[PDB]
Design an enzyme around this catalytic site. Sequence first.
Site, PDB file in Angstrom:
ATOM      1  N   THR A  86      56.963  79.642  -4.220  1.00 37.23           N
ATOM      2  CA  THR A  86      55.196  79.701  -3.977  1.00 37.23           C
ATOM      3  C   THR A  86      54.786  78.629  -2.651  1.00 37.23           C
ATOM      4  OG1 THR A  86      55.190  77.768  -5.548  1.00 37.23           O
ATOM      5  CG2 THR A  86      54.717  80.147  -6.534  1.00 37.23           C
ATOM      6  N   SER A  87      53.763  79.301  -2.100  1.00 35.56           N
ATOM      7  CA  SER A  87      53.120  78.268  -1.190  1.00 35.56           C
ATOM      8  C   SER A  87      52.489  77.272  -1.733  1.00 35.56           C
ATOM      9  CB  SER A  87      52.349  79.013  -0.202  1.00 35.56           C
ATOM     10  OG  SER A  87      53.198  80.056   0.684  1.00 35.56           O
TER      11      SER A  87
ATOM     12  N   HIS B   9      58.652  71.474  -3.254  1.00 36.00           N
ATOM     13  CA  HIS B   9      59.246  71.909  -4.527  1.00 36.00           C
ATOM     14  C   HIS B   9      60.572  70.987  -4.904  1.00 36.00           C
ATOM     15  CE1 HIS B   9      56.505  75.129  -4.982  1.00 36.00           C
ATOM     16  NE2 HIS B   9      57.055  75.709  -3.975  1.00 36.00           N
ATOM     17  N   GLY B  10      60.878  70.977  -6.186  1.00 33.23           N
ATOM     18  CA  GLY B  10      62.116  70.000  -6.424  1.00 33.23           C
ATOM     19  C   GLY B  10      62.480  70.409  -7.977  1.00 33.23           C
TER      20      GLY B  10
ATOM     21  N   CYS C  40      58.501  68.780  -8.430  1.00 35.87           N
ATOM     22  CA  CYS C  40      59.032  68.805  -9.871  1.00 35.87           C
ATOM     23  C   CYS C  40      60.356  68.348  -9.966  1.00 35.87           C
ATOM     24  CB  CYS C  40      59.048  70.476 -10.372  1.00 35.87           C
ATOM     25  SG  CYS C  40      57.413  70.999 -10.227  1.00 35.87           S
TER      26      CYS C  40
END
EC number: 3.4.22.56
Lengths: 230, 235, 4, 4
Positions: free
Chosen positions: A26-27, A85-86, A127
């Site tokens: 996701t952007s 993100h992560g 995340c």
Amino acid sequence: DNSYKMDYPEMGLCIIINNKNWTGMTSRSGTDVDAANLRETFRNLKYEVRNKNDLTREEIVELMRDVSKEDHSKRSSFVCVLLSHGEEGIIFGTNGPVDLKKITNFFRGDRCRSLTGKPKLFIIQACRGTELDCGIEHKIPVEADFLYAYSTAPGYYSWRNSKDGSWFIQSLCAMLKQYADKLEFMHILTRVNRKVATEFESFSFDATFHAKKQIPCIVSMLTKELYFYH
Amino acid sequence: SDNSYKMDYPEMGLCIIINNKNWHKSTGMTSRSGTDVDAANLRETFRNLKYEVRNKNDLTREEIVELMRDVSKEDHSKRSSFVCVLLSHGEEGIIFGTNGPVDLKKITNFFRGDRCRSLTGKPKLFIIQACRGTELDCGIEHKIPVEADFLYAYSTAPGYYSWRNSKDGSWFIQSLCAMLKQYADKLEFMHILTRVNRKVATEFESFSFDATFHAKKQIPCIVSMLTKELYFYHL
Amino acid sequence: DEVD
Amino acid sequence: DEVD
């Protein structure tokens, strides 16, 4: 020697890595609001801010390596903000995951000598897993003087609003603005913790993501108190 | 006619100390000389802070689980806080009973804000003296989240050994009790733990006949999900 | 000195 | 609201 020396000629660098567009992920809508808020916030704290957008996992590592080989001798501290993100222990470049350890290892007390003894701050909005919180109601060690301000608890999602930006960075910038000239950093980060915990709750058409909560996670291996004023 | 936890309930709270020294031989694990010095120091320190201390020695993995479920089943309504001190072998995310591992998460989950209601909104402190891996530091020169109001004071950084002296006790607990004694009437808890960090980082270095383990360093690791400041003196 |  |  209770407080870090913050009266070097410069406060130090603030590196902001802002990954928005990606793999197939996701952007990250609202992240540019975050990156702008941080730039302004750390500008007022007298940090030399560098914003970098949409970096591959190689670019992230090469950037961090180069910055660790600069001469920080005249700088009080170092700040790195990671927006992406992560998963647990991992952040994402635009083309795949990087281990947080690999990034932070460049600034170890033995590998970046001009920052030895100086506070190294990593602020991570990412995340750390996929759990939801449903709520209720004469040597120094080489790992010393790091502070990791995580947006969320180990194992958990981190929340980001598409128009307001992420809950954590929102609260972080607001508390810095209100208290940077009044409070030690940990106590500022504890107020961030409270703001995120109490003032935010997820709203979603999907029942499974609705009415969820978040608590950020302060990880401190600092050896002194940290004040932004003087 | 509120930035600090309410610490004037009629009781400060329980301090549970789990002191594992002797291992079942079948585990292959060795004993932890010095840990009784830690546990006695801890007992006296938290006694002066007005905690009701309960020492438990040499608990199996099932005894640790049972004890924590039971303690989380108590009525804590008249207590301000909760403290649990784990002194044992471990690795990342894990502490050992005398006969095998327990996930730290399974222990701490009993006290989640939704599972232990008389502790909701109250500070829950876990102090862990245990290895978190085998790395050595060579040194140089309406609702609230259910994970809120936990503080984990780890003796060592993620991935690293934690050091224990056989006659003085562990570096971290030594330093923790000394800083608590000197500063609990003066500083907020995070700042006390920051002094503990500096004390361990600067004042301890390993001595070993084995070159692999000689001249090594330690930094503790404060992990905070606290929502307010924590003071042990009040008004 | 020993490790835990 | 979205997760990262």
